[PDB]
Ligand SMILES: */C=C\C(=O)NCCNC(=O)CCNC(=O)[C@@H](O)C(C)(C)COP(*)(=O)O
């Protein structure tokens with residue numbers, strides 16, 4: 001029992017929000033009040049979890065719940 | 076022919092910034108030369124670089140005099 | 152006529168208490184804040200004793216704010232929260248206000264996070280492992296930057312740094328801002344992290360106590376014949392410095408007026424104090440103060456070199472009419488940058504509750520400390536005027552004189 | 559109340575190791591930015607810096623440099639220059655309670671804080687550290703390491719405010735003179751240049767990364783394709799002096815400091831709010847009857863930062879904007895040393911009657927349009943100039959300087 005739904009968990013911790021407020025097509029900036037620097041740290045957090053490097057212009061334009069999960073699958 | 080004998084003087088000389096001739100073997104670091112208690116610490120350290128040994132605290136502060144330094148290395 | 156400055160609120164996180172009540176109790180009792188430290192021992196240091204903060208800071212501060220903070224900023228932030236509540240200031244009163252400012256600093260920024268940053272960079276992940284928050288934690292102005300932003304400060308905003316005199320100069324500068332008419336309120340204070348990364352640098356100097364590791368509460372022992380250096384400590388403190396008419400009129404509670412502030416330089420020895428600089432400093436703070444100094448919180452770090460020089464300077468200033476003297480660092484350890492503001496707070500409690508805290512652990516009084524009224528037992532007394540000394544490396548000196556308001 | 563003037567200056571920067579060299583570079587529009595092996599070998603994405611081009615070996619007495627980091631070294635050399643330039647002798651400024659020193663750095667010395675930790679965790683342990691790490695690494699290092707050899711007896715401490723650091727140092731010096739506490743205050747700052755600190759800025763994404771192969775183009779304030787600032791090092795010092803004291807010894811006076819602004823945003827930690835900058839510039843201009851002829855803008859060449867200041871500039875001046883150039887396009891970002899260096903640049907411009915160009919503006923930003931941004935060296939008689947310094951934590955500093963008449 002582990003899915004791959006923690007990306008939700010990680011985002012939750014980093015942005016300090018309640019797990020239900022994380023919802024697949026929820027945007028980091030526009031909905032979860034993440035900024036400039038929050039973005040940087042969350043990408044990092046997605047690497048500590050889930051041993052995988054994410055290249056700079058790969059990991060940018062990620063930006064919504066969806067595309068974090070999407071990227072990590074097959075990685 | 077001769078490999079050097081006790082360049083201790085050199086270490087002290089450069090550490091305390093003196094003209095080599097002033098390093099008398101009966102010359103004490105504080106009352107002559109002009110070293111302060113922080114100069115001392117660095118000099119003990121420098122004597123460890125040169126001479127590849129370590130010097131315990133309770134040993135290093137019996138060292139004041141140029142001789143005391145010579146004395147200490149010899150037999151170690 | 153020139154503007155006057157008073158303290159209308161305070162806050163503190165220290166080794167002897169996490170607020171002014173806990174500190175008040177520790178001060179009266181002469182309780183040590185010093186403990187043994189595994190961290191210092193495991194690092195390879197000769198000093199294994201600590202003036203640590205006894206508090207888990209986890210979660211005390213909002214995520215978005217603490218993400219920028221080192222421990223110095225955290226202690227200072229928590230002290231400021233106390234000071235704000237204690238001054239009876241509401242958000243509307245001090246936030247988004249061009250005449251409200253903040254001057255707070257640390258002695259050494261954050262060695263811990265500067266080292267953390269270097270390790271991350273030199274590790275397998277390099278730049279990825281560092282994160283975007285090391286600068287704000289490590290920079291020298293961290294304490295002022297990490298506070299002025301969440302508290303919506305609009306007035307002056309920077310850090311004074313002067314080694315162990317840091318937060319004393321911060322308070323003096325806060326006073327100058329009021330005197331110049333530029334600010335109505337200035338939050339002044341500081342913080343300091345407690346870590347082996349910084350402590351070892353002092354140990355390599357021979358500045359730290361090393362012969363009393365088995366009996367931590369006996370290690371800090373100012374004026375004792377057998378003292379061997381200071382006990383490093385951490386913590387924070389903040390005081391609300393306010394223009395007189397602004398404070399009186401909003402019905403603020405006023406602890407004391409700051410009637411003197413001295414700031415001088417030795418220009419002599421880098422790490423060893425000179426008598427003449429301290430004498431000029433104390434005299435500068437006492438100038439135009441018509442009452443006598445009833446109590447003096449001495450800098451007194453418990454070093455062989457430092458303690459007797461300060462006493463000699465005191466003798467020269469007062470002569471035969473010396474005031475009562477105690478060194479609270481014997482209980483608290485040496486908070487470095489936070490020492491000035493914390494010791495100012497201790498003095499203000501003594502002034503507010505009418506007692507003198509003891510200078511403890513003096514088993515054998517030093518030959519050169521003779522005839523100077525050094526207090527060793529808690530003593531109730533009605534005080535009116537007190538003095539606090541703070542000195543730092545580079546021969547930097549600061550003195551504050553505080554006195555009860557009349558009527 | 560008392561007035562304050564600059565009667566001497568000294569500088570060690572990326573575009574010159576004295577005021578003569580710097581004056582020439584300013585007129586040229588020369589760049590001080592070069593490629594950095596050190597930044598690259600460390601793993602950074604940014605490889606360009608505004609480095610100090612000078613051998614410091616032997617320039618300072620041994621008993622004095624043993625306490626110093628690079629920040630202290632740059633500040634010390636700048637102070638030696640400023641003293642001579644003010645024509646002050648040891649009897650005039652040493653062992654004098656009316657002479658003080660307020661100088662700081664933005665980050666002390668990360669290099670030696672790390673060195674101390676590395677030494678401690680390597681063998682030998684405490685023995686490898688040495689007794690000089692604290693004075694090099696502590697935040698007040700620059701002020702402590704200077705006030706002692708120069709026999710300063712007056713005020714002695716460091717202001718720290720990130721990239722506004724040495725600006726607040728100058729402002730505080732003025733206040734010391736205004737309060738009647740000091741006759742002379744040496745004011746300035748320094749900053750070391752190293753990957754230990756530079757990498758932390760790169761981890762933020764604040765540093766230029768797309769112009770490594772053409773370093774002199776990396777710093778490009780007000781250009782549409784700017785990508786962050788170029789870190790730099792150096793030091794600077796100015797002699798801040800009470801007016802009547804300066805006149806009586808026949809001192810050479812560069813300018814009077816007629817304005818000093820210091821404010822806070824209380825808004826965003828790393829991004830400026832504009833509101834604070836407007837209050838700062840207005841505060842510095844209060845009681846200044848002449849107009850601002852030239853403005854040395856903070857202008858770091860970051861995407862977010864440059865136009866925010868321009869918006870703030872418009873609001874203060876309206877349709878009567880002053881001539882503007884960002885010398886950081888040449889100099890890079892000196893962090894803590896930026897305030898005093900840019901003040902010196904502004905003073906040189908005021909003294910020699912010209913305006914330095916804001917270079918590398920290939921495509922002017924769309925939001926940078928209706929303004930007098932100077933791109934070519936231009937001779938002019940200046941009377942009043944302004945220099946802005948902003949730092950992290952929403953801290954602001956503005957200086958207004960004006961010829962004496
Ligand atoms: C020491 C820094 C300094 O000079 N601060 C005053 C000038 N302000 C700026 O230069 C703008 C701050 N820079 C930024 O916000 C960005 O460069 C980042 C730090 C990289 C954050 O990116 P975000 O998308 O906000």
Ligand SMILES: */C=C\C(=O)NCCNC(=O)CCNC(=O)[C@@H](O)C(C)(C)COP(*)(=O)O
Pocket residue numbers: 111112113314315356357358422423424450452454455456457458487542543544
């Ligand atoms: C943070 C330091 C501080 O509190 N400074 C103000 C008071 N100064 C002192 O207490 C002096 C402390 N220094 C020492 O005790 C010595 O270890 C040194 C001066 C560092 C070396 O002494 P030497 O015997 O020359």
